[PDB]
Each structure stands twice: as C-alpha cells, then as structure tokens.
Amino acid sequence: EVENNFPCSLYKDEIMKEIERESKRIKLNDNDDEGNKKIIAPRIFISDDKDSLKCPCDPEMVSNSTCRFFVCKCVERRAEVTSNNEVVVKEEYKDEYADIPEHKPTYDKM
C-alpha cells in the first residue's frame, strides 16, 4: 500500500524538527522529572517540508510546485524586545581600577 500524500522534504533528507518519536515534540510541561531527557512527540506531520520555512509557527500552505508545505506566518519580520526609546547619551562610570589612586579613608563606597 502507498499513501497519496508523499512528504517531499521528509523523503529528501532529515527534518529540522529535531524529533525522536513522532513529528511533534516534547510537551510544554516544564515539570515532569521523568529521568533526564524525556522526548515524546504526540502529533503527526502535516507538512511535506518543515525545514524550508525554518519556523514552525503558524501553518501557512505553500504548494510550491506539487507539495504542501506548512510555512511560518506568525512573524511579520522579527520580534525584538525594545531596549532603547529615547535614552540620553551618557557614559557608565568605572566601578574600580587595578591601581591605588591615593591613601583614602576607611570603608567608603556605601
């Protein structure tokens, strides 16, 4: 017997899904402590290619030529965390130095 839907990329080479069992991955349990590294995939594949998209987020359908590829589409470009809006240019003072500036008093700093 032969399945009608033949996975093109899955038959071409290994899958970037880095999965041991099925085509899913380890559930987002976080806590389970079942030994060391438990890896059980409970879901089957849906795309003939999972490496081309390079992102398993959102299942878009790209037919290309004849295969059904579920490509990433949950990211517009790149979700980067903002860490600079209108920060005033300044210089971070040096904590200490590997030298002796002067005599100094007692335990200062704080």
Side-chain angles (χ1 to χ4, degrees):
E1 210 208 78
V2 197
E3 168 56 53
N4 183 57
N5 202 105
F6 212 58
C8 307
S9 234
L10 304 192
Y11 194 64
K12 156 213 80 180
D13 198 24
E14 199 119 81
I15 195 59
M16 200 217 49
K17 206 31 242 118
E18 357 114 308
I19 188 56
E20 181 109 273
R21 211 60 108 122
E22 212 155 49
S23 340
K24 200 48 213 258
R25 241 245 213 131
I26 175 71
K27 210 174 132 179
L28 266 104
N29 233 60
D30 198 34
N31 173 62
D32 84 302
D33 68 283
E34 210 183 295
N36 176 241
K37 195 148 122 208
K38 155 152 116 230
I39 176 77
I40 167 86
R43 211 98 279 123
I44 69 273
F45 34 68
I46 34 256
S47 22
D48 301 321
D49 192 318
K50 208 88 230 142
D51 170 82
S52 273
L53 26 140
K54 289 251 114 53
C55 164
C57 92
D58 229 6
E60 181 55 278
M61 171 178 96
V62 176
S63 331
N64 326 268
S65 3
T66 335
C67 327
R68 210 176 301 257
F69 293 0
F70 283 33
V71 176
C72 183
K73 207 123 159 292
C74 91
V75 203
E76 200 116 84
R77 261 311 113 185
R78 210 198 136 104
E80 210 90 303
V81 201
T82 185
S83 330
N84 181 16
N85 250 321
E86 200 214 17
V87 189
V88 199
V89 208
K90 211 77 94 125
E91 194 212 357
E92 205 122 61
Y93 54 94
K94 210 141 281 237
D95 216 3
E96 211 179 30
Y97 210 55
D99 207 352
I100 175 107
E102 242 294 315
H103 292 80
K104 273 317 228 248
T106 193
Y107 205 26
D108 67 307
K109 288 121 186 75
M110 30 251 177

